[PDB]
A paper describes a structure:
Neurotransmitter:sodium symporters (NSS) constitute a large family of Na+-coupled, secondary active transmembrane transporters conserved across all kingdoms of life that includes carriers for a broad variety of solutes, including amino acids and neurotransmitters. NSS proteins transport solutes by an alternating access mechanism, based on transitions between outward- and inward-facing conformations that leave bound substrates accessible to the extracellular or intracellular environment, respectively. The transition from outward- to inward-facing conformations associated with solute transport is driven by the transmembrane Na+-gradient. In addition, it revealed a structural fold with the first ten TMs arranged in a pseudosymmetric inverted-repeat pattern with a central primary substrate binding site and two sodium binding sites (named Na1 and Na2) in close proximity.
Here we present the X-ray structure of LeuT in a Na+/substrate-bound, inward-facing occluded conformation at 2.6 Å resolution. The W8A mutation combined with l-Phe binding enabled crystallization and structure determination of a state differing from previously determined conformations. Clear electron densities were observed for residues 13–511 in the chain A and residues 13–507 in the B chain of the LeuT dimer, but no visible electron density was found for the first 12 N-terminal residues, suggesting that the N-terminus is disordered in the crystals. Overlaying the l-Phe substrate with l-Leu in the outward-facing occluded structure shows that they superimpose almost seamlessly in the binding pocket. In the binding pocket, F259 forms a π-π stacking with the aromatic ring of the bound l-Phe substrate and F253 in TM6. In Na2, the coordination of the bound Na+ ion remains trigonal bi-pyramidal, also as seen in the outward-occluded state, but the coordination is distorted by shifts of TM1 (located between Na1 and Na2) and TM8. Consistent with this notion, Y268, which forms a cation-π interaction with R5 in the outward-facing occluded state, has moved into hydrogen bonding distance of D369. Furthermore, the critical salt bridge between R5 and D369 is broken. Relative to the outward-facing occluded state, the putative release of the N-terminal tail and disruption of the R5-D369 interaction are accompanied by a conformational rearrangement of TM5, which corresponds with that observed for the apo inward-facing open structure.
Numbering used by the authors:
A (entry chain A): 13 to 510
B (entry chain B): 13 to 507
Write the structure that this text describes.
Amino acid sequence: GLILAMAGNAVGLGNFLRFPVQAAENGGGAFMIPYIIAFLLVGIPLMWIEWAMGRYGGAQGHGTTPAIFYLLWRNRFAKILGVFGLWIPLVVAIYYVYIESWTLGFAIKFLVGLVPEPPPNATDPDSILRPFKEFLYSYIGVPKGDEPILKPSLFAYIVFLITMFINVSILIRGISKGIERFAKIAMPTLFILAVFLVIRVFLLETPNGTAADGLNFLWTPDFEKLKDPGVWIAAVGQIFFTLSLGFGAIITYASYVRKDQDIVLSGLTAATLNEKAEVILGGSISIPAAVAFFGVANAVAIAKAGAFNLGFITLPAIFSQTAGGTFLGFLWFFLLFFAGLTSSIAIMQPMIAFLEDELKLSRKHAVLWTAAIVFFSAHLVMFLNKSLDEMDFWAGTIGVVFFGLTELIIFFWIFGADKAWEEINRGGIIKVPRIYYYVMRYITPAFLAVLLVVWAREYIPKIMEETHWTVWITRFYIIGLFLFLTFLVFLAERRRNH
Amino acid sequence: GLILAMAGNAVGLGNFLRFPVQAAENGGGAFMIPYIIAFLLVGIPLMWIEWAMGRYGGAQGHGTTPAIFYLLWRNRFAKILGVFGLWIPLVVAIYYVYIESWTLGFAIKFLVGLVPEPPPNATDPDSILRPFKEFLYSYIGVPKGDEPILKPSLFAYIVFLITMFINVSILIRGISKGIERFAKIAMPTLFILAVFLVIRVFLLETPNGTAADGLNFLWTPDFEKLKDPGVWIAAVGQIFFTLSLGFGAIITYASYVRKDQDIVLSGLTAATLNEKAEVILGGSISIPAAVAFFGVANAVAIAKAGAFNLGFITLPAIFSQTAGGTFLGFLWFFLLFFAGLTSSIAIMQPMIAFLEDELKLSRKHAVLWTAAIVFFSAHLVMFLNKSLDEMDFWAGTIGVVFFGLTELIIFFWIFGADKAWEEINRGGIIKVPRIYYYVMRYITPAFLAVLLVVWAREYIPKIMEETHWTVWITRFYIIGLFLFLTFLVFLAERR
Ligand SMILES: N[C@@H](Cc1ccccc1)C(=O)O
Ligand SMILES: N[C@@H](Cc1ccccc1)C(=O)O
Ligand code: NA
Ligand code: NA
Ligand code: NA
Ligand code: NA
């Protein structure tokens, strides 16, 4: 199935770790209403856009974003906007591989038996949260008092090295046959273990809450929080993150596929299985269990205190109250690691492809230098408090929605609305309904543009008053990354005409 | 002929700002004894070596250290060590241009009469230091109490922009005939002004000290601190800095010289001319006056609190007591600005020369991108406390004594001492005395290698115990710059 490779990179850490965080910190229910609208009016059509843009420029030997933007709009300002097609995946990879290494480190701990346990006599939210919170915080090195320096354990650093070595050895060697035999075993195993864990979580009855309260917290909307654009832009950004949109990823992969081929039905199918994997499996396992085990206030606080910490704290609590949970926990975090592994090798693909097709580097050299830029930068994420969340906000939330609007104007307003409508439907098994045409030309592009404006007039004053230097150094570091990548595209521009 | 071009290279901010700080920071006399030894055993021989390597490499179209090292020694490790010939000039330029902008800002202050004045009815050495300390600290934004974030004035930021604009213009359009007409008037005027100031300083007496006490501070040796390797490595590092050695700068300028011109006489004349402007002019004005005005305790404390601050505090105190001092303060800081301008366009030369010969960028593009890296990186030294001092130590002190040793190993142990001796003395008006053949081949490398080791086993443990996050981020940043420049050299080969 060709829809499984389109969802093998879509289903990853965003489904089981980022979604519970994004939903619980933004309210739940108040977050789900725009999250559904973003999937219909924004997420689905942009999937059709990036596959159409990619195979269009890919038919002329262009797999990189600046080369395709300039092919769709001949202007040096288009190649500058194409740098986000390299900057966003690079910044996300700086922490994504690190979060991926957390799942491998937890899998090794569960296999060997090092698991967190609830206290003997607690039966109150903060006391039973402490063993599971300290299990994660002492691994990633969270101190007390909001001190800016993290002290991760030596085991966590070594597991990060091993995770980098696994990503590099696959990007160089390629997809192996044993990996293909392991992938066809992990896809049912993940979507069978997920079935049991939805049943297990549903009958959770604790003195601190019920799973029914977690589903009540997640599916009852608060309409006064719909006036908050930070809730809206967190929802439209999570849609882009989970669908692998707003990066430079999908446009690079359609460059390697063929024209006169279906990008409509298969593009709609992988976008649905992915939402089935995180709304049902990623959303009704982690969130209701956190509300049942720790209550609402503590579940929201854990979600606000990190970008991926909720699932790492909630799932071991489930497995501590389940017969054989230590074994199932090994399966959970090892399969979650494989989900992140197939995504991280995909996130780092546009950067490696740029060093190949534009700077004429070999596979071995393009991979190893890309890994050097990720490993070196990851030390900010590993050792600076809130540095990981900052990269996740500007690349994984704000960056994807700005770069998603940019794609929707270059391809649908400058390249031609009717001209782009033909590129989407070519070879389609089914046809895109006519109502999406007016949505892609007048509704969605004139909605993301308004959201970023109504958001920036309210939160940018709060952002520029940031007091933590660990945050400003991260903002300074990622600006240097965008300038560094702009310099690389310049070296490619003075090489094509040289 | 070309001696004045080497003197516009050498004579700069290291002569009048850094040398007073480096000497007063380690004591003086205890600093000058290894300083004179470093000029004879290290500075002079490595001046001839960099000029000889540049010619031999420039004759084949190479002007940067990664390509010239690989030409003399065909190894992967040669191009990696050649990155320092790009990294040290880049790191130094990150803060050198900013220090250059200070002299321009003070020149504008003194032109319009915004001068610091000592308080009346007070001879307290802390009360008279206070307004001169505040004049600099309010400009560069030093807070009270070791806070990590600097807050320099808006005027200091705008003047930095203009200093960047002046460097970019001259680097693109070249040295105009109007400013070449200016250099022949400015550098003589600076020498005449400095000879006047040392006469003025020598006639200083205060209720807190005299200038004769200052000369006793700088020239009376202390033999207990002669066993401190940090003092030895600061004197050797200063010799490299003031003579423009230990960079890839002299090698790039030598890459345009014919292989049959004179190196020995012209290089020895420029080095000695530079030292006269440093110990006789720069060192004899700032330090004796700081001791006379503020005392020895404060002169050492100011030298340790910053990397270039002492000259900016001491000199306006001199001008506050001299008739016509505000006008003389204008000419001093303006000719000090021009002395830094001709030096900073030479510092950014290896980076520009690497973006053209390799990577095949135009002159307009190589200057603007080099100016972008420097301008971006300068915000660390502008806003993070002790970041400027950290870059100045690892590049301007430790890096130069390491890269100078590296140039010496590859040219006299790998390329061949008999071939290098033939290449230095080729076309020379006079010949190098035979005693330097054994200094270059045996004495100098055995001296620099030992000095680096004994320094590293007495100070690396204290370096790893840093308590300021602002210095670890600077160390993290400059490691990133070296990896970045190693990536560009890699892109040069596979082009
Ligand atoms: N969509 C993936 C992340 C990803 C983005 C871009 C390319 C590949 C993967 C996730 O939710 O985990
Ligand atoms: N030697 C100069 C600095 C410099 C170094 C290298 C090249 C050019 C200038 C000084 O003392 O100020
Ligand atoms: Na995946
Ligand atoms: Na996903
Ligand atoms: Na000098
Ligand atoms: Na100069």
